[PDB]
């Protein structure tokens with residue numbers, strides 16, 4: 001890497017690791033198109049395995065960027081429309097609170113207060129139907145945003161229904177494969193287990209537990225290389241050959257709703273560039289934050305002058321991705337500790353600001 005990239009990265013990440021006591025980390029900087037990789041520490045403390053460019057990390061909610069794009073790809077194929085009622089794709093959802101709730105509402109957390117978590121008690125699929133039927137919205141659709149696995153997760157599951165493909169099969173075929181993300185998995189194959197980092201929570205090695213709608217909301221594991229390729233694809237969608245996938249990327253970076261300085265896409269969240277990190281932090285320690293939203297009518301197509309980003313966490317991992325299309329610049333930070341979001345954003349901002 002250019003010494004300038006080397007120096008900003010090392011000066012920022014070294015103190016981060018020390019301060020947050022992160023066991024292992026991988027970072028990619030995308031700079032004028034090309035990726036530069038950096039790794040530190042341990043994928044597996046007990047077995048003394050280092051983090052490498054092939055190490056798999058749990059992305060947590062960064063998985064929603066994939067769900068958003070796969071939804072966008074289904075829209076572009078004409079399989080679904082965001083303006084359609086949820087009940088068009090799930091006819092058994094006959095409870096009257098569902099009248100007026102569209103796939104757009106699910107994708108953007110605006111359905112009227114769907115809960116942050118699907119309950120653990122929800123094992124089977126009829127449990128899942130029962131959960132959504134019995135749910136009582138606090139608000140009318142399209143009035144408030146409440147970040148929720150149950151909202152984006154349902155969007156993911158329903159988006160792939162017309163295809164007839166399982167969510168995993170649709171994701172593999174329509175997103176991972178075309179983009180050459182060959183080390184990106186919803187379920188880690190036995191062949192790749194050697195590379196699956198452990199997460200660390202209170203000193204203990206942990207992996208994310210199975211849960212309803214896990215794949216759709218928080219279930220993807222990836223390497224720093226595949227994540228850099230993902231950022232490249234999102235920086236330059238119009239260079240992707242598969243037409244519907246190209247459209248799907250642009251649809252996921254469209255601005256549907258505004259809360260403060262933040263805009264909600266499908267999975268991705270965006271702010272106008274330039275922006276101060278105080279704004280990035282604040283517009284992204286709170287278990288539940290209900291925020292009124294203003295509809296962007298109609299949605300703004302992907303703005304190149306944006307800070308486009310997503311944070312991600314599981315019990316044992318913390319991830320962050322941010323890019324600025326106008327500057328052909330991006331970063332991915334993957335760690336096997338869930339450490340505070342403000343520290344992730346600060347570090348990413350320090351790096352990208354220095355390089356632009």
Ligand SMILES: *[B]([O])([O])C1=[C]C2=C([C]=[C][C]=[C]2)S1
Nearest residue numbers: 060061062117218312313314
């Ligand atoms: B994502 O990394 O923001 C997630 C947030 C939660 C997940 C699972 C359970 C509760 C919150 S994934």
